[PDB]
């Protein structure tokens, strides 16, 4: 949303209210613009979890946003970001999240819980074609059970930029099973 | 009493400033908070 700059001035820039952030795209880049105030808001939403874009000179109103960056620093306040769009029908590198609900099985009865080394899902469905919020939770939880890749259950866009059997999300003893 | 490290008892015990000093106060002998 907006964000400007692109000359050659990171220090002061990298300072005050404007944080660096390259204009990255397949084939071309352009001095870092943006700002340490927009990043906020938007970013705050869900960086590489949905997507938008800003109007700098109406130039090229396109999506893709961030494919890297960091609040690095100790303090925990980012500085020096990466930005790449995608006006193509190739959109792959697509990492969008996946949520459950709380289906009661090991929890609200066994107190047991479950780790989710997954959460996210870098795949590649129908380029410029993904439900910013995809949910899938067949339920199940408790004892020494576990679920991961393999099973899963992918809708429409048949990608899986990923593999089978691997960090899905199991149920462990928040105390003992 | 605790001179050092006072922090709210009864769901009231107030925060007062005497001599810049901060000494707990609240409807209870069981709160005579002071530092």
């Amino acid at each position: 949303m907006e964000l400007t700059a692109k000359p050659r001035t990171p220090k002061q820039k990298l300072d005050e209210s404007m944080i660096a952030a390259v204009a990255y795209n397949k084939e071309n880049n352009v001095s870092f613009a943006l700002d340490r105030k927009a990043f906020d808001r938007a970013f705050r939403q869900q960086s590489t979890t949905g997507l938008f874009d800003i109007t700098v000179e109406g130039g090229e109103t396109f999506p893709a946003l961030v494919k890297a960056v960091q609040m690095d620093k100790r303090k925990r306040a980012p500085i020096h970001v990466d930005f790449y769009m995608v006006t193509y029908g190739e959109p792959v590198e697509v990492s969008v999240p996946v949520h459950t609900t709380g289906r009661s099985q090991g929890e609200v009865q066994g107190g047991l819980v479950d780790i989710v080394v997954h959460n996210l899902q870098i795949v590649a469905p129908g380029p410029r074609r993904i439900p910013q919020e995809l949910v899938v939770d067949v339920t199940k939880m408790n004892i020494g059970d576990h679920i991961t890749a393999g099973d899963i259950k992918l809708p429409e866009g048949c990608t899986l930029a990923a593999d089978p059997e691997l960090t899905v999300v199991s149920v462990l003893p928040p105390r003992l099973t | 009493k605790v001179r050092s490290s006072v922090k709210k008892m009864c769901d009231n015990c107030k925060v007062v400033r005497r001599h810049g000093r901060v000494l707990v106060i609240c409807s209870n002998v069981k709160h005579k908070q002071r530092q």
Partner: protein, 138 residues
């Protein structure tokens, strides 16, 4: 930064003796956690402990995860007196590099675990930073 004699000649190849990592429960978004800023050969023991007392006060779901672990150690009095000092080991830990990803109170809505960790900081030693993660804490 004086460190030890080697990873297998003086004292290197241990378990360091402690109480493992993970606790609490999952959680996809909710980013609940703890880190620092202080530098200190984190006092093993003190360490191990601490964190633990953490579970002691909570119990189940709240990423009682914790990303620390000592692995080297000091030495001192053993032998003659003060001069040509050989070495007697004791007390390993790990450098808490001027702040960084401590342990995580990670989960949907379960501050009943935030306060926890909290109790976890209180403890510890080198001050500590109370914080949230990508998004905050819900």
């Amino acid at each position: 930064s004086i460190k030890p004699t080697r990873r297998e000649y003086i004292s290197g190849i241990p378990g360091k003796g402690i109480a493992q990592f993970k606790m609490g429960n999952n959680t996809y978004p909710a980013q609940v956690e703890n880190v620092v800023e202080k530098p200190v050969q984190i006092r093993h023991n003190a360490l191990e402990a601490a964190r633990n007392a953490a579970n002691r006060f909570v119990q189940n779901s709240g990423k009682f995860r914790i990303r620390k672990f000592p692995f080297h150690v000091i030495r001192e009095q053993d032998g003659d007196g003060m001069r040509a000092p050989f070495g007697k080991s004791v007390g390993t830990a790990a450098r808490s590099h001027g702040a960084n990803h401590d342990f995580i109170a990670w989960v949907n809505p379960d501050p009943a675990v935030e306060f926890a960790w909290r109790r976890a900081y209180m403890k510890v030693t080198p001050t500590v930073n109370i914080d949230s993660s990508p998004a905050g804490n819900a």
